[PDB]
Design an enzyme around this catalytic site. Structure first.
Site, mmCIF file in Angstrom:
data_model
loop_
_atom_site.group_PDB
_atom_site.id
_atom_site.type_symbol
_atom_site.label_atom_id
_atom_site.label_comp_id
_atom_site.label_asym_id
_atom_site.label_seq_id
_atom_site.Cartn_x
_atom_site.Cartn_y
_atom_site.Cartn_z
ATOM 1 N N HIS A 62 -9.257 10.997 -1.336
ATOM 2 C CA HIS A 62 -8.668 9.960 -2.188
ATOM 3 C C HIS A 62 -8.565 8.641 -1.434
ATOM 4 C CE1 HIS A 62 -7.536 13.350 -4.577
ATOM 5 N NE2 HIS A 62 -6.984 13.878 -3.483
ATOM 6 N N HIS A 92 -2.492 4.176 5.177
ATOM 7 C CA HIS A 92 -3.708 4.269 4.397
ATOM 8 C C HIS A 92 -3.808 3.006 3.568
ATOM 9 C CE1 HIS A 92 -0.561 5.712 1.750
ATOM 10 N NE2 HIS A 92 -1.268 5.061 0.815
ATOM 11 N N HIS A 94 -5.476 1.275 -0.340
ATOM 12 C CA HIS A 94 -6.061 1.369 -1.670
ATOM 13 C C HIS A 94 -6.924 0.134 -1.826
ATOM 14 C CE1 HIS A 94 -2.993 4.435 -2.786
ATOM 15 N NE2 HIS A 94 -2.284 3.764 -1.880
ATOM 16 N N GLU A 104 -2.320 -2.027 -5.591
ATOM 17 C CA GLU A 104 -1.472 -1.237 -6.499
ATOM 18 C C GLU A 104 -0.365 -2.126 -7.045
ATOM 19 O OE1 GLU A 104 -0.741 2.602 -4.471
ATOM 20 O OE2 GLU A 104 -2.297 3.223 -5.913
ATOM 21 N N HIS A 117 -0.556 0.634 3.032
ATOM 22 C CA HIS A 117 0.717 1.332 2.942
ATOM 23 C C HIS A 117 0.998 2.046 4.253
ATOM 24 C CE1 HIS A 117 0.300 1.588 -1.662
ATOM 25 N NE2 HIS A 117 0.786 0.420 -1.256
ATOM 26 N N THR A 196 2.683 6.651 -5.114
ATOM 27 C CA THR A 196 1.712 6.197 -6.093
ATOM 28 C C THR A 196 0.581 7.190 -6.301
ATOM 29 O OG1 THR A 196 0.258 5.014 -4.625
ATOM 30 C CG2 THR A 196 2.162 3.777 -5.469
HETATM 31 N N1 LIG Z 1 0.580 5.497 -1.829
HETATM 32 S S1 LIG Z 1 1.959 5.839 -1.238
HETATM 33 O O1 LIG Z 1 2.972 5.929 -2.269
HETATM 34 O O2 LIG Z 1 2.233 4.992 -0.125
HETATM 35 C C1 LIG Z 1 1.863 7.455 -0.515
HETATM 36 C C2 LIG Z 1 0.654 8.131 -0.507
HETATM 37 C C3 LIG Z 1 0.516 9.366 0.100
HETATM 38 C C4 LIG Z 1 -0.854 9.946 0.146
HETATM 39 O O3 LIG Z 1 -1.322 10.150 1.291
HETATM 40 O O4 LIG Z 1 -1.542 9.947 -0.861
HETATM 41 C C5 LIG Z 1 1.591 9.924 0.776
HETATM 42 CL CL1 LIG Z 1 1.545 11.416 1.475
HETATM 43 C C6 LIG Z 1 2.834 9.279 0.754
HETATM 44 C C7 LIG Z 1 2.943 8.044 0.138
HETATM 45 CL CL2 LIG Z 1 4.490 7.279 0.171
HETATM 46 ZN ZN LIG Z 2 -0.607 4.275 -0.906
#
Ligand SMILES: NS(=O)(=O)c1cc(C(=O)O)c(Cl)cc1Cl
Ligand SMILES: [Zn+2]
Length: 258
Positions: A62, A92, A94, A104, A117, A196
């Site tokens: 993803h 990571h 998006h 996002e 993020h 998200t």
């Molecule tokens: N997109 S996000 O809300 O930061 C988020 C994504 C993930 C993921 O790896 O998909 C994880 Cl485990 C925690 C958070 Cl808090």
């Molecule tokens: Zn994220």
């Protein structure tokens, strides 16, 4: 038939497996800058990343995660809206198929090319898995990316992506300093929200920085060469891995700045 970002499994479908998708504190949201309220009682963020220990980078099908050693207080977020200490576990991004989408969160409906993020968990809960069961379990520092000049501190990430092209691949990724991904200012907006991505748990204090970082077109183009698919499967470029803005409902977005 697992969740993803396609037509048949994308964000409008997630509620069937994860009904909290239609909950009261979902993320992301549009940040309406004129109706966010300056809160003079908020504190400066404290971002303490000097002792961060990155370990590995993983294509999870993803996005890709840069993972940290979170078995001690090495890289922590404190202050701002937060009570107590939150430990960095991973970051990571998006991003979009085109520079006009990918973030996002939005700002007055504006979409950025990407969004970083940095995910942190509240040490009072002991581990990440316990933290995500709590309404104050996580703090995510969100940083917008716009296309322009290169971000030097991103290039080490960019250059390893060819080694993790497909789902399930990882690579060693030690000695990466996430301080190199931060903008100059720590001015921010904050609100209570959610993951998200599925399972969409309502456990996040969001801290979204006002100042974007700039990355080059070549840097984001390399993000867009990643694959959602596994090795030896037909190629599905990893692009448009963003959830759109969700209803704000009974929430107020607060600003750290006037
Ligand atoms: N997109 S996000 O809300 O930061 C988020 C994504 C993930 C993921 O790896 O998909 C994880 Cl485990 C925690 C958070 Cl808090
Ligand atoms: Zn994220």
């Amino acid at each position: 038939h697992h969740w993803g970002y396609g037509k048949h499994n994308g964000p409008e479908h997630w509620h069937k497996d994860f009904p909290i998708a239609k909950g009261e504190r979902q993320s992301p949201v549009d940040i309406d800058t004129h109706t966010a309220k300056y809160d003079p009682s908020l504190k400066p963020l404290s971002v303490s990343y000097d002792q961060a220990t990155s370990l590995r980078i993983l294509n999870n099908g993803h996005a890709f995660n840069v993972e940290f050693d979170d078995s001690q207080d090495k890289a922590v977020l404190k202050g701002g809206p937060l009570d107590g200490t939150y430990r960095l576990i991973q970051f990571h991004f998006h991003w979009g198929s085109l520079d006009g989408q990918g973030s996002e969160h939005t700002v007055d409906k504006k979409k950025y090319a990407a969004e970083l993020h940095l995910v942190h968990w509240n040490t009072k809960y002991g581990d990440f898995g316990k933290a995500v069961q709590q309404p104050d379990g996580l703090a995510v520092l969100g940083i917008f990316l716009k296309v322009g000049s290169a971000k030097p501190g991103l290039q080490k990430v960019v250059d390893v992506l060819d080694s993790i092209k497909t789902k399930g691949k990882s690579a060693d990724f030690t000695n990466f300093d996430p301080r190199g991904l931060l903008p100059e200012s720590l001015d921010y907006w904050t609100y209570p929200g959610s993951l998200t991505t599925p399972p969409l748990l309502e456990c996040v204090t969001w801290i979204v920085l006002k100042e974007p970082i700039s990355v080059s077109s070549e840097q984001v183009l390399k993000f867009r060469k990643l694959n959602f698919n596994g090795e030896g499967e037909p190629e599905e470029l990893m692009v448009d891995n963003w959830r759109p803005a969700q209803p704000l409902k009974n929430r107020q977005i607060k600003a750290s700045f006037k």
